[PDB]
Subunit: 354 residues, 2 copies
């Protein structure tokens, strides 16, 4: 049961609605991508992201002043192909370079890496930010690292304010990478999503089961455990953020000066007493907004007990998984300079403040 | 399967979360209601509404500059009692009177009318606007008229901007009543919501059925019909707004000069070729945002064919029914003066622009 017409047409119809609804956005065709109406903006770093459809408002909802210059939607839960990304970046280059924000998945990484090389060869100054905030990893053989989830939104906003303020390409990439090392996420599901071309949900769950450590692509989580109460659920999530906070991994970034990928080992420290944070209680798609307030209520108690100070918050549907019933919690460690970037103007379909 | 703890505590915990999340709000206790942190604002008409919980963000998400002065939440899908309303109005009176916005339900009307008389007797200048936008009525004996649904949000914003620029109580009331006569709504459901004290959803639907003409209290609609496609669904909704737009009914308003209720026969005219409209595509709770863009896409086509011009739009979760899978469409006739009230600053948890 989905509000769609023909299955071949679902995205054409939804992107048509997006363009008609938002005069500040330009829907480009052949290939299809979205940019701010006034892109390219001369003399500022352009910010680009993209990924599968089915995460609305991520990413097209974040295109506008103080956030993304453009976004490349793909098929449902499928990365965009290098051609969209190439053309989108060429469309938004304002003479100061383009920063690509890439969520850590195999498809996304491959496609965005391919476009990056293609761009550099056409003389576009470009570098990259990889997001890998989801702390839930199944104990098995593999490989893919940590997934990029809701902290992508917070980094997009903070790096967007830096770009808009007029920071250089390198300063913007450096902030994005630093913030990646300081943001932590975990998601749960009480019910699965259904992809239009399915006719049945991603997975099934008994009435007393939750899927713990879930992504954004409808995938089952790292395991099935009992669902007992909101407080218990929030408590296991918050505890996991702490115990899985420490993380060492190899990441690649495009070095445009040398025309090659620079590998780096990077370390995340866990959140500690005394840290100041931005909290995102993110709807995965079909949870009542009221329940998210109940989650926020418990989250503040656990933060207070652990010595964490929530400085700012976002509560709502910011990075979704179609019609999945569940939510995620993201905590991102900030300071005075980062808070000032948060409070800066943003004028997008999904986030607006002045 | 709900994100709650003890059933007795659901609202206590969600309202705690609301208050901790939003420093611009003050949560008052004994009795519980919500106001702007700086209420009462001296020298301006105060706007107040309220209703059952379960419609979040309506109404507490609409408290702030340019919209509600305060709101009285009741129990899940139950009107607040006269004591909350009385105390809330007393808290927000700025010396210029209080305007109560009431959704047309048996419980809401009785409770807000009782508080109106009480306030009048305490020397508070007060009057009322009734909202009865839902054009779907079952053909049977009953007697409650038309329900107040998502047009309440648009009216609260437009009347909120007029109160904020300094219009008198009478001018704000007349604007609210005029707007009520020019707005038309209809909702459908593909899946029912579940109230916490239920453990089963409010109705069941075959996989090819929809509940047509549904409200916001999880009630089944005016009938069950086949569900075939997004387009057919939107078309039946749109067609229904037209054919049921004409409406003659009796409303009561508080005359504060005579200290009595003033009955009035009021007429709604249907939407017509050449009309300019604000369009709201409202999530009833668990519909993916992407699908709402597909609805907007079809809605624009039908509006254009009918000769209607959509001047502004809102798309998202603005007046919900817990975890109901469905949506409503609201069209409100406007002119230059009304659009300028729409474009005016509003600073609330759910609506924010500059």
């Amino acid at each position: 049961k989905k509000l769609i017409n023909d299955v071949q047409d679902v995205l054409d119809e939804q992107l048509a609605g997006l363009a008609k609804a938002h005069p500040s956005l330009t829907l480009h065709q052949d290939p299809v991508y979205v940019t701010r109406a006034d892109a390219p903006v001369a003399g500022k770093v352009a910010l680009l992201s993209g990924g599968g459809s089915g995460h609305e408002p991520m990413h097209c909802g974040y295109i506008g002043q103080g956030m993304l210059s453009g976004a490349c939607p793909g098929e449902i839960f499928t990365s965009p192909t290098p051609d969209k990304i190439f053309e989108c970046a060429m469309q938004v280059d304002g003479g100061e370079g383009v920063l690509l924000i890439i969520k850590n998945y195999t498809g996304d990484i491959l496609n965005f890496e391919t476009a990056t090389e293609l761009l550099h060869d056409s003389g576009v100054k470009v570098t990259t930010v990889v997001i890998d905030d989801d702390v839930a990893v199944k104990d098995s053989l593999y490989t893919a690292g940590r997934r990029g989830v809701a902290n992508t939104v917070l980094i997009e906003k903070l790096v967007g304010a830096a770009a808009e303020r007029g920071d250089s390409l390198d300063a913007c990439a450096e902030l994005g990478r630093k913030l990646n090392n300081q943001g932590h996420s975990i998601g749960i599901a009480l019910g699965a999503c259904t992809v239009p071309a399915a006719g049945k949900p991603s997975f099934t769950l008994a009435d007393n089961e939750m899927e713990f450590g879930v992504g954004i692509h409808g995938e089952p989580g790292i395991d099935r455990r009992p669902f007992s109460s909101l407080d218990q659920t929030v408590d296991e999530m918050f505890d996991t953020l702490l115990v899985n906070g420490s993380y060492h991994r190899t990441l690649r970034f495009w070095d445009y000066q040398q025309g090659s990928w620079q590998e780096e080992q990077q370390t995340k420290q866990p959140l500690q007493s005394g840290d100041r944070v931005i909290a995102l209680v993110n709807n995965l798609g079909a949870t009542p907004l009221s329940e998210l307030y109940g989650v926020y209520n418990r989250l503040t108690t656990r933060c207070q007990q652990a010595g964490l100070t929530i400085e700012r918050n976002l509560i709502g549907a910011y990075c979704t998984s179609l019609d999945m019933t569940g939510f995620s919690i993201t905590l991102l460690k900030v300071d005075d300079e980062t808070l000032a970037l948060w409070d800066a103007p943003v004028h997008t379909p999904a986030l607006n403040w002045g």
